[PDB]
Ligand binder design. Structure first.
Ligand SMILES: CCCNC(=O)O[C@H]1O[C@H](CO)[C@@H](O)[C@H](O)[C@H]1NC(C)=O
Ligand SMILES: CCCNC(=O)O[C@H]1O[C@H](CO)[C@@H](O)[C@H](O)[C@H]1NC(C)=O
Ligand SMILES: CCCNC(=O)O[C@H]1O[C@H](CO)[C@@H](O)[C@H](O)[C@H]1NC(C)=O
Ligand SMILES: CCCNC(=O)O[C@H]1O[C@H](CO)[C@@H](O)[C@H](O)[C@H]1NC(C)=O
Lengths: 171, 170
């Protein structure tokens, strides 16, 4: 039921607002004063206007640095999220990563889906399970993902916790 | 405090995958077998291929009824989510609601942000907070939102619980 700061930065389904207390719902007590994520009445700031912060809920960051959905947000000047313009990444784009864990396809475009995350995926949430660590020549994962004790890349206590080899380890 | 079925359908941030046990992460233990939401390695079904089920995580539903992002999903034939094509709604579209609580703006397009949700919003997550119920000539809320005892539309114990006047009351 908990969302936001009280719930590991989780997000409510269906664009429901996460209230100042960290519960999901709709209306003033959720989307008004203190809303943390979802369809907040005061849109969050993002991009160049907000020190490079990204939007939550896979929203688009507009040219003016507000998060939302629709042409004004995702169309021209969109700075982040699922922008209408194709988003370049990977070896085709100076090794740039995809935001929000999206997969960088073999062709250097950001998305999710087997075309992006399957054979040839360069970074992000690739489904292809490349070994890391001491039994894989010291290879580190992409995206600063944690290399687990068993030499697999991921995020979560099994990866970043005790026995983590590289990446965003706990300690 | 959990995602997915163990946490009232909560979603993880940043497309992290919700494991079978309701924990958010990345890698095979999360995105592999049992993945409930996020960037699951086996993409979910959606659209006309799956009973009109929508995608979770504001993903685009492709022409083929799979959830994801990028041109193949949001471009030609996109059935839902942040399609690249403008999405019609409201009185200009025969009363059609926007999916996933998106606001139907005055001009009859789906979106989120003050143009869509502010003055003139027809339905979905409008900020205009029009009064409902007894003190509002019996007006009921859009989207089956609950009308609270105080005369304001929403979803939550204070709206749908004791004193709920109309909509999807408990
Ligand atoms: C499309 C032009 C009219 N829209 C506008 O100025 O809204 C901008 O400024 C508004 C604040 O003055 C803010 O609420 C709104 O989110 C902002 N919108 C975007 C797309 O960034
Ligand atoms: C304000 C009148 C001029 N602007 C306009 O109609 O934009 C509306 O129509 C545009 C489609 O013509 C569409 O791309 C855009 O997202 C729509 N914006 C809203 C907030 O519904
Ligand atoms: C025969 C299929 C070729 N398809 C292709 O190269 O599309 C790539 O390039 C497109 C830009 O030309 C872009 O719109 C599209 O998302 C991209 N797709 C991926 C997975 O990166
Ligand atoms: C026939 C055109 C080529 N592309 C394709 O069918 O992949 C589609 O079918 C795949 C399953 O065969 C599935 O992995 C993938 O998510 C699907 N992609 C989209 C855009 O929905």
């Amino acid at each position: 039921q908990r969302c936001g700061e009280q719930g590991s930065n989780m997000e409510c389904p269906n664009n429901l607002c996460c209230s100042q207390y960290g519960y999901c719902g709709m209306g003033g007590d959720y989307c008004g004063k203190g809303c943390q994520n979802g369809a907040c009445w005061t849109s969050k700031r993002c991009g160049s206007q907000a020190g490079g912060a990204t939007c939550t809920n896979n929203q688009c960051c507009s040219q003016y640095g507000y998060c939302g959905f629709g042409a004004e947000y995702c169309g021209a000047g969109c700075q982040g999220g699922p922008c209408r313009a194709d988003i370049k990444c990977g070896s085709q784009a100076g090794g740039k990563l995809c935001p929000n864990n999206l997969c960088c396809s073999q062709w250097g475009f950001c998305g999710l889906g087997s075309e992006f995350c399957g054979g040839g995926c360069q970074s992000g949430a690739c489904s292809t399970d490349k070994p890391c660590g001491k039994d894989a020549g010291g290879r580190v994962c992409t995206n600063n993902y944690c290399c687990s004790k068993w030499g697999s890349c991921g995020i979560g206590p099994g990866y970043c916790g005790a026995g983590c080899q590289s990446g965003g380890c706990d300690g």
